[PDB]
Ligand binder design. Structure first.
Ligand SMILES: CNC(=O)c1ccncc1NC(=O)c1nc(C2CC2)ccc1Nc1cncnc1
Ligand SMILES: [Mg+2]
Ligand SMILES: [Zn+2]
Length: 313
């Protein structure tokens, strides 16, 4: 109860910045995450005996994939933590509790394949969920772990606070289905231009949290160039594996995934930052001004990829 976590000075300072890397030491990530809950939400809002067990069950149910892994979970939670702490008043005590849990669980039991690959493979999970396949799987795994004994971190909420918090987490996890991002950004844009946006409209908050979630989920692109560059490798390791699996199914895959089209990557990154990342953070900064560091860091990296093409690295 009087048992706050501390961190090495460098981590204590660097953790409050959007562009924080959580480092190569697996065994501190749980301490980092707990620390984020305790500053973001209070020393009280989760019983330590129960949080720590939830964290360790969630670690266990991520897999050893190059990108969609436990380290990705915690990066995404960190980024959400930075947004909450720079947007201190805008969000309820419940939103704070649910969104960090949402982020930690957002990719539970991911195998490193797209919704598309399950559909073309005819994987059972595509039968049981037609759209946002992995995302309904991830929310489903999250509820399963919450029902293990000594794992209900929410035990002390009222029935209705409980239903609110699980409903936050579910929409939050679903929003990480980038297929849904595009229209969710379009609608939020139109509501901020035409000034109709209202953060007491619960359908409006929903969209906003949805964008926050896209932003956190993509936040490897808002890191210092050396981190972005090296995470790009991890994401492509998965893509090229999927491309290989597409070919096995006798389907020439999209070039993003053809490991014989490695040359076309830097142009592909350009396309992506232009089509997706820049738009995401632009609209996010438009809505939540204190998140600009994300847009600035995104732009730097876009520029770093322009320099790649021009032969300058
Ligand atoms: C939707 N279009 C495309 O996904 C795209 C197209 C052409 N090339 C690349 C593309 N996607 C990505 O690069 C990418 N995608 C994603 C999710 C799967 C969708 C997440 C992070 C990414 N980048 C990244 C991350 N961390 C460090 N460096 C880079
Ligand atoms: Mg995902
Ligand atoms: Zn993710």
């Amino acid at each position: 109860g009087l048992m706050q976590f501390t961190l090495p000075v460098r981590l204590c300072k660097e953790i409050e910045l959007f562009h924080f890397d959580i480092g190569p030491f697996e065994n501190m990530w749980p301490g980092i995450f707990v620390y984020m809950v305790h500053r973001s939400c209070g020393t009280s809002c989760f019983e330590l005996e129960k949080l720590c067990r939830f964290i360790m069950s969630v670690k266990k149910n991520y897999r050893r994939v190059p990108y969609h892994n436990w380290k990705h979970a915690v990066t995404v939670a960190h980024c959400m933590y930075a947004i909450l702490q720079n947007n201190h008043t805008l969000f309820t005590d419940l939103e704070r509790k649910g969104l960090l849990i949402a982020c930690l669980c957002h990719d539970l039991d991911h195998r490193g394949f797209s919704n598309s690959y399950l559909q073309k493979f005819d994987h059972p999970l595509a039968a049981l969920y037609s759209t946002s396949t992995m995302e309904q799987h991830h929310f489903s795994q999250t509820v399963s772990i919450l029902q293990l004994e000594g794992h209900n971190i929410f035990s002390t909420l009222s029935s209705s606070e409980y239903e609110q918090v699980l409903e936050i987490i579910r929409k939050a996890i679903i929003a990480t289905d980038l297929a849904l991002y595009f229209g969710n950004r379009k609608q939020l844009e139109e509501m901020y231009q035409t000034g109709s946006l209202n953060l007491n409209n619960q359908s409006h908050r929903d969209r906003v949290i949805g964008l926050m979630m896209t932003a956190c989920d993509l936040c490897s692109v808002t890191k210092l160039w050396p981190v972005t560059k090296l995470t790009a490798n991890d994401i492509y390791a998965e893509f090229w594996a999927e491309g290989d699996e597409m070919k096995k199914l006798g389907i020439q895959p999209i070039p993003m995934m053809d490991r014989d089209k490695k040359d076309e990557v830097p142009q592909g990154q350009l396309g992506f930052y232009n089509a997706v990342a820049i738009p995401c953070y632009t609209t996010l900064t438009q809505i939540l001004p204190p998140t600009e560091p994300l847009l600035k860091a995104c732009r730097d990296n876009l520029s770093q990829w322009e320099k790649v093409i021009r032969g300058e690295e």
